[PDB]
Amino acid sequence: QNGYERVQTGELETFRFEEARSTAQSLLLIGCSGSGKTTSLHRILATYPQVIYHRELNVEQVVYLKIDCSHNGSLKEICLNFFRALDRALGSNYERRYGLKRHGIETMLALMSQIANAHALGLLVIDEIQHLSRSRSGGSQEMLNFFVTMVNIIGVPVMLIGTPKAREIFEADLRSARRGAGFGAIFWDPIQQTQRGKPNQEWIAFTDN
Amino acid sequence: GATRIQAVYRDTGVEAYRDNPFIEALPPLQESVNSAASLKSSLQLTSSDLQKSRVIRAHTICRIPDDYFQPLGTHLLLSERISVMIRGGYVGRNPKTGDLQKHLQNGYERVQTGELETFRFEEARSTAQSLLLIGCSGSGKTTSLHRILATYPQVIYHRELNVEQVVYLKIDCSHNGSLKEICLNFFRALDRALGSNYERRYGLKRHGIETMLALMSQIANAHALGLLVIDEIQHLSRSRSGGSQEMLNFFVTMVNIIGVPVMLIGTPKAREIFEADFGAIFWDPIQQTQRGKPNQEWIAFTDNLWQLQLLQRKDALLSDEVRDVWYELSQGVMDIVVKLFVLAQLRALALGNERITAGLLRQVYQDELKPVHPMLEALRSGIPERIARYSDLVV
Amino acid sequence: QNGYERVQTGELETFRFEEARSTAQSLLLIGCSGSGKTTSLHRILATYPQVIYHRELNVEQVVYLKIDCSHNGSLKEICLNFFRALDRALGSNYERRYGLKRHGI
Amino acid sequence: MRNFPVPYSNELIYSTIARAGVYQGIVSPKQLLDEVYGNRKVVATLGLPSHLGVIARHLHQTGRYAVQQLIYEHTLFPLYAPFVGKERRDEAIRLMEYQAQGAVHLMLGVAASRVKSDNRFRYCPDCVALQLNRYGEAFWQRDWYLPALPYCPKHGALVFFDRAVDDHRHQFWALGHTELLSDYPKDSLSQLTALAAYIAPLLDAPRAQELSPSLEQWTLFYQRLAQDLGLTKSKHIRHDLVAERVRQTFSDEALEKLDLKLAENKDTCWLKSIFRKHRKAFSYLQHSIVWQALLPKLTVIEALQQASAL
DNA sequence: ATACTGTGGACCAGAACCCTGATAAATGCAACGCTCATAGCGGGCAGACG
DNA sequence: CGTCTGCCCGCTATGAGCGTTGCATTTATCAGGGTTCTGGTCCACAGTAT
Numbered sequence A: 001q002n003g004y005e006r007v008q009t010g011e012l013e014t015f016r017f018e019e020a021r022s023t024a025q026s027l028l029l030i031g032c033s034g035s036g037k038t039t040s041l042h043r044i045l046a047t048y049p050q051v052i053y054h055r056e057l058n059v060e061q062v063v064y065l066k067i068d069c070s071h072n073g074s075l076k077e078i079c080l081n082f083f084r085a086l087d088r089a090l091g092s093n094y095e096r097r098y099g100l101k102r103h104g105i106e107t108m109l110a111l112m113s114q115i116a117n118a119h120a121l122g123l124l125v126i127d128e129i130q131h132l133s134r135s136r137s138g139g140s141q142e143m144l145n146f147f148v149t150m151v152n153i154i155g156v157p158v159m160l161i162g163t164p165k166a167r168e169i170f171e172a173d174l175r176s177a178r179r180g181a182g183f184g185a186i187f188w189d190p191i192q193q194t195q196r197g198k199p200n201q202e203w204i205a206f207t208d209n
Numbered sequence B: 001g002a003t004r005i006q007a008v009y010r011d012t013g014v015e016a017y018r019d020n021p022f023i024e025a026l027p028p029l030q031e032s033v034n035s036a037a038s039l040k041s042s043l044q045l046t047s048s049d050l051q052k053s054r055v056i057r058a059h060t061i062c063r064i065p066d067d068y069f070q071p072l073g074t075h076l077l078l079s080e081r082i083s084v085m086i087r088g089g090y091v092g093r094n095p096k097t098g099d100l101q102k103h104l105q106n107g108y109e110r111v112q113t114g115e116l117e118t119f120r121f122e123e124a125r126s127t128a129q130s131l132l133l134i135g136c137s138g139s140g141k142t143t144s145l146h147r148i149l150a151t152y153p154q155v156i157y158h159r160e161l162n163v164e165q166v167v168y169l170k171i172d173c174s175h176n177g178s179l180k181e182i183c184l185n186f187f188r189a190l191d192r193a194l195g196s197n198y199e200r201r202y203g204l205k206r207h208g209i210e211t212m213l214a215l216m217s218q219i220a221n222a223h224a225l226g227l228l229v230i231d232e233i234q235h236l237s238r239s240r241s242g243g244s245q246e247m248l249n250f251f252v253t254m255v256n257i258i259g260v261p262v263m264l265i266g267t268p269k270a271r272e273i274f275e276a277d278f279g280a281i282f283w284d285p286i287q288q289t290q291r292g293k294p295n296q297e298w299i300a301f302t303d304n305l306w307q308l309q310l311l312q313r314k315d316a317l318l319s320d321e322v323r324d325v326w327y328e329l330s331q332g333v334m335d336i337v338v339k340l341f342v343l344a345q346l347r348a349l350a351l352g353n354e355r356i357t358a359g360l361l362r363q364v365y366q367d368e369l370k371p372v373h374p375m376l377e378a379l380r381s382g383i384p385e386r387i388a389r390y391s392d393l394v395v
Numbered sequence C: 001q002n003g004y005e006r007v008q009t010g011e012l013e014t015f016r017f018e019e020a021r022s023t024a025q026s027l028l029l030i031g032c033s034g035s036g037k038t039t040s041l042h043r044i045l046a047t048y049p050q051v052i053y054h055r056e057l058n059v060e061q062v063v064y065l066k067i068d069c070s071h072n073g074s075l076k077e078i079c080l081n082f083f084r085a086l087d088r089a090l091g092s093n094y095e096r097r098y099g100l101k102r103h104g105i
Numbered sequence D: 001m002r003n004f005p006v007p008y009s010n011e012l013i014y015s016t017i018a019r020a021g022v023y024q025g026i027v028s029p030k031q032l033l034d035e036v037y038g039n040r041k042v043v044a045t046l047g048l049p050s051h052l053g054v055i056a057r058h059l060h061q062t063g064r065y066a067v068q069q070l071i072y073e074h075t076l077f078p079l080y081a082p083f084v085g086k087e088r089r090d091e092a093i094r095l096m097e098y099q100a101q102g103a104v105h106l107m108l109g110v111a112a113s114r115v116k117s118d119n120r121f122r123y124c125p126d127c128v129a130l131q132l133n134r135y136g137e138a139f140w141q142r143d144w145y146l147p148a149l150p151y152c153p154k155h156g157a158l159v160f161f162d163r164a165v166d167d168h169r170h171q172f173w174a175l176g177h178t179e180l181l182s183d184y185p186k187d188s189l190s191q192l193t194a195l196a197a198y199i200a201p202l203l204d205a206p207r208a209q210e211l212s213p214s215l216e217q218w219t220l221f222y223q224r225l226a227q228d229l230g231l232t233k234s235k236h237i238r239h240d241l242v243a244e245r246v247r248q249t250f251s252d253e254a255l256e257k258l259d260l261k262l263a264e265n266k267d268t269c270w271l272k273s274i275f276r277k278h279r280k281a282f283s284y285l286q287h288s289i290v291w292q293a294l295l296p297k298l299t300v301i302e303a304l305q306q307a308s309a310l
Numbered sequence E: 001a002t003a004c005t006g007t008g009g010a011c012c013a014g015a016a017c018c019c020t021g022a023t024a025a026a027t028g029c030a031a032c033g034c035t036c037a038t039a040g041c042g043g044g045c046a047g048a049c050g
Numbered sequence F: 001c002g003t004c005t006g007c008c009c010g011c012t013a014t015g016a017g018c019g020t021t022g023c024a025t026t027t028a029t030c031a032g033g034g035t036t037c038t039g040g041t042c043c044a045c046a047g048t049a050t
Ligand SMILES: Nc1ncnc2c1ncn2[C@@H]1O[C@H](COP(=O)(O)OP(=O)(O)OP(O)(O)=S)[C@@H](O)[C@H]1O
Pocket: A023, A175, B065, B066, B068, B069, B070, B071, B072, B136, B137, B138, B139, B140, B141, B142, B143, B144, B267, B334, B335, B338
């Protein structure tokens, strides 16, 4: 109010009111099956508590959350996996209230953007992103748009894990390729016995122990 | 939702803006000399930060993309157009001299008879104007709009009246070109910017689509909505059977009949919708050379970006080779230019060589930017046949 | 055919063929209690055989029918007593067809 | 509710609530009742409304409009406020701030005449031109809905149309000019127009807020006026000279229209009851007629001040 | 001066709106079925090497 | 030129959105009582006729 009054009087030339948050960060982890992409995450995220309770406020900060894609390639079941997983992280029930059949995808995608801010989530990792292609629910352009509008709403960072056949899903346009490699892209490879002109040391270290 | 601001009325020097409260409660227009400096932003970099630990110097680098903004030539033109088309949509909706009340009486017929061309009065005119923005992906359409619209108070309250003026609003299309889920998006944004509950009042009583389209244009006049922005208009191509034309006509009726200005943002792929059937602005990536001499915009951008380093053994100044490889890899798209710098610094910290060279830039580009390679390769080729698929350049 | 559009329209004065005509009359009977207004009517109408089945056609002529007014004076019960008394003397089921559905008077 | 309109100058709160649902596109009356009030048991009333306070809550931020201003400026309360007396005025004011509708009518016993009459929606076609050329809106005005005068204090007769307030109990109706235009001239009486002009300035008078006499003040005022006037018997009326003055001032047709026809033959007459010791409050018409016939050069406010001071 | 006409005043009973209870009729909401797009397998039928 | 290789192709199962249905709830109708309210009524008193 003081800034507005002073800029209307003429003392101050410029003032900046409240603004909007930027698009959420995103990461892509791609590697062959059997390389250890689930074990690595489950050991890295195990050092963080899941639910921290704050006494001065009244929020139960859910630090991370893990769900997985559906075999249909359906877009409405990865909106119910969210509620189902969050009812196990906490003791609450949300799939009974917000998981009705009247609500569409565009309404569930906005209902899950409020319980992700009541409990301040830190991550949302989606596993087995390979199962998206060849879905009878809709076309490829009806999911390449669902991902863009899901990144542009929730506010929490997202991590995507999949096999090397998921490159062609996210490499169809610049709008989705820019968002897929939002904070870099990690490609994993099997261990090599010979590194440059000398035997590998990582292989020997792994085998001896 | 948003903090309300008690209005103080100013004295506009324009004859047409005589006694309209809605455009005297607005902040004053600014000259172009300071409009190119009211948007600039940068990160602090206290001189004692170069001696901190590696983890802190790594978590400080990551905030460069979110806090660095540089105003360009086109931002001034866009800001002036937005200011004019915001302050010019209120002259036909004066609340004092019985002119807004002639619009709210007409709207009850439209919601009552279910038609948007029903009129009771004939001297209630509307002036709105319109705009359309088109540019390649990553060019900076939304981050340079949230920054422009950040100088306005949004909700304003008048005590002489009992009206809450909502200066601007922003929504986006559905993932399919649906019809019932744009009205609900409008209601959700409206009652998230005010704190009310209109989604339970309208749109949950099983109304037909025409009734919803009629109710959407009345609650947008109860609060004097100065500007409406629809983001990602390219989602309209996947609409239902013949539904693409319906909302394309509807966004024309509001500008022409009701009076609410409308702005549309999209990619070059969305040009085909309008070609089949609004002013046009076209945005393109930075070119290194356009006059036969080096572009001053590119030099200024790189020179201002280079001064944001936390590396201990930082280079004295940016050499020509580093600039040339930086343009070669990035080709001028805004997002890659900053992200490449951030990743190069993040790798230089952990690798141990706290410097930046051309080879490090090439190695980071090869390793960590795999999915973006074909589009930049097509841009570097400069062949229209290759760009005919993706790469988002208008022919 | 005239009666189908009366069902569709809801107005009982419409017509399609002008040649269709009615040739019916009306009667009213009043008397003090104990006079015998019910048993005498039953004895008179017991001469006719009610349901008669025709072979060249496929109709089943119903010579007469008797109902009574509801005690409550309701308008929806006089139209249900008719169906009950009709399917009691035929063995059919018309109350489920017509009475059960949500219909205005 | 977020945007409740401020009342226009000289408007009943019924029109304001009616416009508060035209400005926002609410069609079904039940939805409007559930939004504005929160109950579906409220009854729409033109003149002397109840349930006030929720209306003042909506206009809270605009600091001027409170319950007192709404009661004394945008209703028909000042017509009944001074004549009832000091005893029941405060109780009625307290009652109008809560959810007791019929109790207010009972407390204002002059308005507690059981079933009312002439509930049709009145209007004056000449004033609507000014309303449209000044505000852009058309609304019910307190001049039109006088308790017994279907006349406008500045133009003449009122054009009725046959829609009743009690026809739909829960519906708030707003005037529309396209439906409105049904003007046709009617018979007019100049005496009743002059009476309406005389009685009009009582509505916008601040004196009626804090000044009200009592029954014994009324009878003392009447007896002093009769004694000083000189046309009296021994501590009684002549019963002929006062009636002759009333007939000279006002015709018999006017009193027949006003439902106060003079009855010389019968012992029970409203004028005779006025002269005798007061037992119940009387309407504004009888007091106005007595004042005009007996004081032909004094204004309403000063006459009330004279009656109340002594 | 004292007995009769008129009148002031105190006053009961018809009656109108409010509260209570029981039964019939008009909506609103949670549940269920209709329709349209999308993907694919396997068998039956136009042109092959023999 | 016909059966195998491609091609057609009718068919089948699945899911998200829209339109329809039955039950419970609200709303309306009607009779009964009642309790104060007020509206006209009769009695006692002052002032006037023998
Ligand atoms: N003038 C600028 N100066 C600095 N960074 C900029 C500038 N313009 C854009 N950016 C960067 O651009 C990124 C934001 O990209 P967006 O504005 O969302 O692009 P976009 O137009 O929204 O792409 P889409 O997916 O088609 S909507 C951030 O990393 C900003 O730092």
